């Protein structure tokens, strides 16, 4: 009974899904606001973790021989796209080739099956390039293409990490990126930019994300799932670019876009760089970002690091800095060595700036273990240049003084803050009214 | 005869630039926001009975709509009149 | 004990008398309204799981 499980449900629900998608592709040809994402969550929940290997009991090995001809496992794969089957069902023509592509890698057995993925991907490549030149008619095959192409060529980029580097992934997708751009965004533009940034960042290469900056703009219809990816990536660009403020802002924007608890790896990655970009501004991160369960024993070292940073004792930070370097490299953020070991003073002078309305240039040095006030004057001056501290400095009498605590409510500031929220709320209303009706 | 009779309800320009009364306007906002709170209190209950027993325009929704409309327009017009008076009259 | 409105400053050795503005109930009503809108927002979060 467990082996016949796909026959009871999966074989018929997948047929119903294909029929429904084709019907939407045939009637109500705007098959872009349909069940595609809602249904394709079934893929990750069930299908890629089921189609991976040539299972018997008609589960995988019996798919193609029963699906051999549709005129109203590679050798078995050749026939569903062959045998004079009707080809107007472009979603069917795409899916019949793309069905093993993601699961075949999801098997990850890596043995002679990497060749299978490596060739089944070029089968899809040939199908897509043949479809592109003929100017396919209006049946949303660009949408069906872009995402599955992104995933499958991501897997082929993993394979090109096993062997010769993944440059080919970029060069092709970039060419498709304009191809997607000149017609319309089928949500493919977002994922193509995301993969373009990912290919740059895997090489830690970054700067030629001149694409990411406004030379070409990111589309607004990224399903909140491409949004999180692109925002994390641009946060990582802006972080090392020494502009930590807007990076932290945009990536705090990004973090809330993740699901409840299913994106544990992505959540870990986002928090992993959010906490450090926050300490780069001297701000101690939030405690709740260390209390999520699956995130404790992963974010624990930087927690200890944070315990080291809320002191002037950078020697304590260094004493345990080398203790976990290899797990910093395994998590791909060890370049923290270049960007924390010297700015640790910034947080200390921050706390002083919070605690003291007025202080002496000697005193600021004493309680964060700095050597001489001649150094402390430069430290506080630097804090002013960065703008992290709103103080003022007067060496003539040894003064470091916070500016006047004026009442803000009797000024323009509350109106400005309320104007931002007015614009936000009216924008929410406008985009809400834009999208009621479709029947 | 049209707009000869209309001069009877015709608003005067001083009536247009009239700034109402700030104490009375504050009292009006005070009352309307409190009414908004009391409407939202049962609007919460109405949304928490979303379960669709015996599928049924009284109370929360449209009343909240008219309240927000009148409050927002009154506040906007008062602020605009005050601002115009501030900048134009000296 | 709030039985008297005024504020001390020892650094000048002085006490100060102020005007005690009347709390302006508008903002408290505002806070209750926005908190209850947060509650109804959680209610809609309970919805939309049916999609």
């Amino acid at each position: 009974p467990p082996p016949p499980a796909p026959q009871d449900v999966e074989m018929k629900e997948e047929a119903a899904t294909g029929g429904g998608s084709t019907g939407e592709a045939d009637g109500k040809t705007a098959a872009a606001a349909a069940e595609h994402s809602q249904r394709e969550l079934d893929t990750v929940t069930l299908e890629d973790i089921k189609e991976h290997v040539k299972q018997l009991e008609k589960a995988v090995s019996g798919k193609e021989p029963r699906f051999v001809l549709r005129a109203l496992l590679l050798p078995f794969l050749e026939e569903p796209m062959d045998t004079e089957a009707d080809l107007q069902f472009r979603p069917r023509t795409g899916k019949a080739a793309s069905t093993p592509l993601l699961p075949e890698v999801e098997a990850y057995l890596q043995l002679l099956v990497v060749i299978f993925m490596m060739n089944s991907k070029r089968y899809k490549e040939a199908q897509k390039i043949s479809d592109d030149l003929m100017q396919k008619i209006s049946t949303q095959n660009r949408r069906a293409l872009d995402l599955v192409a992104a995933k499958c060529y991501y897997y082929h980029a993993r394979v090109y990490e096993f062997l010769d580097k993944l440059d080919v992934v970029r060069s092709f997708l970039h060419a498709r990126l304009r191809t997607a751009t000149l017609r319309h965004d089928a949500d493919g533009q977002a994922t193509l930019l995301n993969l373009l940034l990912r290919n740059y960042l895997h090489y830690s290469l970054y700067d030629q994300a001149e694409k990411l900056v406004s030379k070409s703009v990111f589309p607004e219809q990224a399903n909140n799932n491409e949004w999180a990816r692109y925002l994390y990536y641009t946060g990582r660009i802006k972080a090392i670019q020494l502009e930590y403020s807007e990076a932290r802002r945009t990536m705090t924007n990004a973090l809330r876009k993740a699901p409840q608890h299913t994106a544990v790896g992505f959540k870990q990655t986002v928090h992993k760089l959010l906490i450090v970009v926050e300490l780069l501004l001297g701000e101690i991160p939030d405690r709740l970002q260390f209390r999520q369960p699956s995130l404790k024993r992963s974010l624990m070292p930087y927690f200890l690091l944070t315990q080291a940073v809320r002191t002037g004792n950078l020697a304590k930070f260094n004493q345990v800095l080398d203790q976990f370097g290899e797990k910093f490299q395994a998590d791909g953020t060890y370049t923290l060595i270049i960007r924390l070991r010297h700015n640790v003073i910034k947080t200390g002078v921050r706390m002083i700036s919070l605690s003291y309305s007025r202080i002496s240039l000697a005193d600021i040095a004493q309680k964060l273990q700095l050597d001489s006030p001649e150094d402390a004057e430069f430290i506080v001056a630097k804090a002013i240049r960065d703008g992290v501290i709103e103080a003022s400095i007067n060496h003539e009498k040894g003064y470091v003084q916070s500016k006047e605590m004026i009442d803000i409510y009797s000024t323009r500031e509350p109106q400005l803050a309320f104007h931002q929220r007015i614009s936000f709320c009216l924008d929410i209303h406008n985009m809400s009214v834009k999208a009621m009706r479709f029947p | 005869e049209q707009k000869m009779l209309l001069n009877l309800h015709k608003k005067s320009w001083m009536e247009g630039l009239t700034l109402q009364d700030y104490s009375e306007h504050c009292k009006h906002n005070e009352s309307v926001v409190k009414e908004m709170l009391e409407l939202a209190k049962n609007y919460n209950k109405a949304v928490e009975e979303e379960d669709k027993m015996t599928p049924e325009k009284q109370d929360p929704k449209r009343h909240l709509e008219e309240h927000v409309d009148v409050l927002m327009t009154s506040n906007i017009v008062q602020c605009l009149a005050a601002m115009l008076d501030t900048v134009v009259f000296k | 004990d709030k039985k008297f409105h005024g504020i001390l400053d020892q650094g000048e050795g002085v006490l100060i008398i102020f005007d005690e503005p009347p709390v302006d109930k508008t903002y408290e009503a505002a806070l209750e309204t926005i908190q209850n809108m947060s509650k109804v927002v959680d209610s809609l979060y309970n919805k939309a799981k049916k999609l």
Binding site: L426, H429, S432 | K61, M72 | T33, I34, M37, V40
Partner: peptide, 30 residues
Amino acid sequence: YLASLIRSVVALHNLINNKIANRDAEKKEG
């Protein structure tokens, strides 16, 4: 601010209910 925020909330509430209703009709039609 309060009025606009409440307007946005009610707008979202109409939007979600409209989506639910039309999706219910679509699911029943099949």
